């Protein structure tokens, strides 16, 4: 009765499904919202008002986070939550800036903590977690924004840390990134480079061997923001290029078929500022070797509305799974717009 990957439900294109807008209707102040779905329910996690008021809350998806509906979990500024198969797991970090401390909340009782190593800032995905076979996988980093912030993978089971994974290769900057089960054997991520490169460092995780390799994506569509013009960086794939300063988390979600894997992406429509979302797709191939452009597949949010932090996640169906992608919008309380894969034809 655990959690295992399966095949995705049939479909061709994303369609709008829902939105939660507490600004319209005692709403809280929430930021960095992320959603993980268990076998029976989904919770809309968030962070309320770094300071000592930063708490991790959760309301059932579909419900606006009121004061009486929101259950507090922990005092942290960087959250993560998923379902190992039987009950909920949570991760959060707080403390002093230079000496931060990670926390685990499993079932109802607090279990374990982990300390910092590079002694600058310790932080996690700020999104959901991916757990397979009772071994739940997370990513944490420690270092500087303008320096080196090397990342580590965590292997937690029943609320207890088991193993740490050290990536190999170009590992000089990685932070703030969603992940998804590409397959049973290989698990991917899509991350953010703040200073060096205006691209997304692509991480490959193997659950069987517990090894990580980080390579930059060779495609022409530079998904990060701010970005230069597409296809303006010459040379090999690992060339950082110009205007690599700055970054933002980007959506990323899989599409599991019988004998083929498709990949959805997203980015900002604007080149420099964060005004509006758009969705761009690629079918199959090697991310580390293919420089072909992503196929445009719709306008996600119009340019008159702000497209901030986005996430990627899955909702569990009876016999399959649905890949759904969501976006946060700000105004400083946040709304969410949640889009799922559904039907066929063309996106409106």
């Amino acid at each position, epitope marked *: 009765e655990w959690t295992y990957p399966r095949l995705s439900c049939p479909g061709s294109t994303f369609q709008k499904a829902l939105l939660i807008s507490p600004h319209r209707f005692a709403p809280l102040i929430i930021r960095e919202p992320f959603v993980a779905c268990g076998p029976n329910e989904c919770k809309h996690f968030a962070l309320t008002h770094r300071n000592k008021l930063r708490h991790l809350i959760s309301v059932k998806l579909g419900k606006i986070p009121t004061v009486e509906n929101s259950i507090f979990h922990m005092a942290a500024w960087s959250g993560s939550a998923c379902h190992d198969g039987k009950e909920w797991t949570y991760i959060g970090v707080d403390g002093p800036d230079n000496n931060a401390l990670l926390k685990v909340k499993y079932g109802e009782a607090y279990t374990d903590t982990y300390h910092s190593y590079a002694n600058n800032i310790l932080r996690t995905q700020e999104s959901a977690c991916n757990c397979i076979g009772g071994n739940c996988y997370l990513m944490i980093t420690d270092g500087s*924004a303008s320096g080196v912030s090397e990342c580590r993978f965590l292997k937690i089971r029943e609320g207890r840390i088991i193993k740490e994974i050290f990536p190999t290769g170009r590992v000089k900057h990685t932070e703030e990134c969603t992940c998804g089960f590409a397959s049973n054997k290989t698990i991917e991520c899509a991350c953010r480079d703040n200073r060096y490169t205006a691209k997304r460092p692509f991480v490959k995780l193997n659950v069987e061997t517990d090894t990580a390799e980080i390579r930059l994506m060779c495609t022409d569509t530079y998904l990060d923001t*701010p970005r230069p013009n597409d296809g303006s960086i010459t040379g090999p794939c690992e060339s950082d290029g110009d205007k690599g*300063s700055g970054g933002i988390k980007g959506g990323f979600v899989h599409q599991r078929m019988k004998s083929k894997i498709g990949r959805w992406y997203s980015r900002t429509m604007s080149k420099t500022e964060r005004m509006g979302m758009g969705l761009y797709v690629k079918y199959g191939g090697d991310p580390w070797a293919d420089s072909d452009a992503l196929t445009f597949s719709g306008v996600m949010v119009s340019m008159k509305e702000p497209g901030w932090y986005s996430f990627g996640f899955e909702i569990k169906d009876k016999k399959c799974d649905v890949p759904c992608i969501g976006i946060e919008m700000v105004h400083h309380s946040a709304a969410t717009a949640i889009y799922c894969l559904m039907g066929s034809g063309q996106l409106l």
Partner: nanobody
Amino acid sequence: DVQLVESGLRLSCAASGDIFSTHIMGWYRQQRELVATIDTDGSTNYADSVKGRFTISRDNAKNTVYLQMNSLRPEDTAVYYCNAESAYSDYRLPDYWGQGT
């Protein structure tokens, strides 16, 4: 590191590194009151007292922005500071203060 230098009639606010595409530039004169700002998308904002008299032009290639005066008034005599504040809290770089002219 990265610093801002002012040499300005023509003004030049030269910067090092790659802060020209992520930080919001401004001009402050000397109380401390707004003069001129630009963004990284081309949008230009100016103070109410200085409508239609300031022209701002940037150069992404070599990391220096320009400012030009027309019909100078005696009331404009001040020391002008070019700064590089970051509009986003998610960006972990601070504002840098130039020496000014």
